[PDB]
């Protein structure tokens, strides 16, 4: 079985130095570089990952279409559907108590 | 001879580092506030947990650190200064709190930010209010009684993390982790096991001190080792304390 050399950079096996083995049209087995995985947004209240948005690294994320980075609601990314339902209710119910305390 | 271990470890390059610190711990300065508890966190060198608070100063949001009392939670609203209610975790002027109550983080003079009771499991007791002089007597966890003016502030509860000294550290590595952030030498080599160039207890054909271990308060610094200015020694019973409020 054919064995590999490091084509570029350092041999020292840090997080930035992941590699995989690949077979070429010329029938050689060579190392090729790998980019790191990305984490997408977590909710600002509960720590849950937001639905409807992609996971990518900051530079690659910025080059995608805007639709990959939001949902069409009051808080776009930012917060999940349950947390917005709570926020909408809370603001309403507080105003009604103040209404009563003003009228009485 | 040469300089002893006790002096070398007091030089500046040996002082504790602050790079992992969260901030300076202490009360806000304002006459009244409403605060929210944002997070409860561990800080690398300290066994009692800290609470991050958020309060408005002018229009702007500002952040502070308190030591956590037991029974707060993330999201709780707390009331600071004059006109706060007697509820667990509020901060109040000392003259408002009834006798026999338990308090933490007491200011020694107004607006100092809180000193006194700050270690896990500790509290102070309010023992007397004097309506003429506007003084209050507090009993500290050493047993000492001290007088503070009624305008000083204090936190209502016991400091979190009590009970920690119940579980013995059975192994050498467990002690290692505890002393890694402190200033004391660990492991500690005994002075009688050194040569006379290194320590006043060194040398001789048997391991012994050879001279009395009780030393004067006014002795020169590079030989002030042993029991410094001891009033008595040994395992026998002492005498009655004298007490005034």
């Amino acid at each position: 079985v054919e064995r590999q050399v490091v084509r570029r950079g350092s041999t020292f096996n840090t997080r930035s130095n992941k590699r995989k083995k690949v077979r070429t049209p010329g029938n050689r087995l060579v190392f090729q570089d790998v980019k790191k995985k990305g984490k997408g947004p977590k909710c600002g209240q509960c720590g849950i990952k937001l639905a409807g948005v992609k996971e990518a690294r900051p530079a690659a994320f910025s080059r995608m279409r805007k639709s990959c980075r939001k949902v069409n609601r009051i808080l776009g990314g930012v917060q999940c559907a349950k947390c917005v339902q709570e926020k909408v209710l809370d603001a309403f119910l507080n105003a009604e108590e103040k209404r009563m305390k003003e009228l009485e | 001879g040469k300089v002893i271990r006790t002096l070398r470890l007091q030089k500046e390059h040996w002082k504790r580092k602050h790079h992992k610190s969260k901030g300076i711990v202490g009360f806000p300065t304002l006459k009244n506030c409403e605060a929210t508890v944002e997070k409860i966190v561990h800080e690398s060198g300290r066994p009692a947990p800290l609470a991050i608070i958020n309060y408005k100063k002018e229009e702007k949001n500002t952040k502070g650190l308190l030591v956590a009392i037991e029974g707060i939670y993330e999201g709780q609203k707390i009331q600071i200064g004059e006109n706060a209610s007697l509820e667990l975790g509020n901060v109040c002027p000392i003259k408002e709190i009834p006798e026999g109550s338990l308090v933490s983080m007491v200011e020694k003079k107004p607006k100092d930010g809180g000193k006194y009771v700050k270690s896990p499991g500790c509290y102070a007791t309010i023992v007397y209010h004097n309506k003429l002089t506007n003084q209050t007597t507090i009993k500290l966890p050493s047993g000492e009684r001290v007088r503070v003016t009624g305008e000083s502030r204090a936190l209502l509860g016991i400091i979190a993390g009590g009970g920690k000294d119940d579980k013995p550290l059975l192994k050498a590595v467990n002690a290692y982790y505890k002393y890694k952030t402190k200033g004391k030498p660990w492991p500690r080599v005994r002075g009688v096991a050194m040569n006379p160039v290194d320590h006043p207890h060194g040398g001789g054909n048997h391991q012994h001190v050879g001279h009395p271990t009780t030393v004067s308060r006014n002795a020169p610094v590079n030989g002030r080792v042993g029991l410094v200015a001891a009033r008595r020694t040994g395992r026998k019973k002492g005498s009655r304390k004298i007490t005034v409020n």
Binding site: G47 | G162, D166
Partner: protein, 87 residues
């Protein structure tokens, strides 16, 4: 469970360290690992994150507590005194 007569959770240590010391450690070690009841949601899902900080695995609430138990003896008493002050 409970395959040993006396040694309990301290069986991990074999014949090392003293007998008397192990039976003090045991009290704390059994207390640390248990799940406890949540005040906010009623479920038995509370566990320790770090000394002094306790946390619920369902609803996410964090609360200050003791080193090896969520509520200490001094707290159970003092909490009552405050409720009387409010009267």
């Amino acid at each position: 469970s409970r395959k040993t007569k006396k040694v309990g959770i301290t069986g991990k240590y074999g014949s090392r360290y003293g007998s008397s010391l192990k039976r003090r450690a045991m009290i704390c070690m059994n207390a640390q690992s248990k799940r406890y009841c949540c005040s906010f949601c009623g479920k038995t899902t509370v566990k320790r994150e770090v000394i002094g900080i306790w946390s619920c695995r369902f609803c996410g609430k964090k609360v200050s507590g003791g080193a090896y138990v969520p509520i200490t003896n001094q707290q159970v008493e003092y909490k009552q005194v405050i409720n009387r002050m409010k009267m």
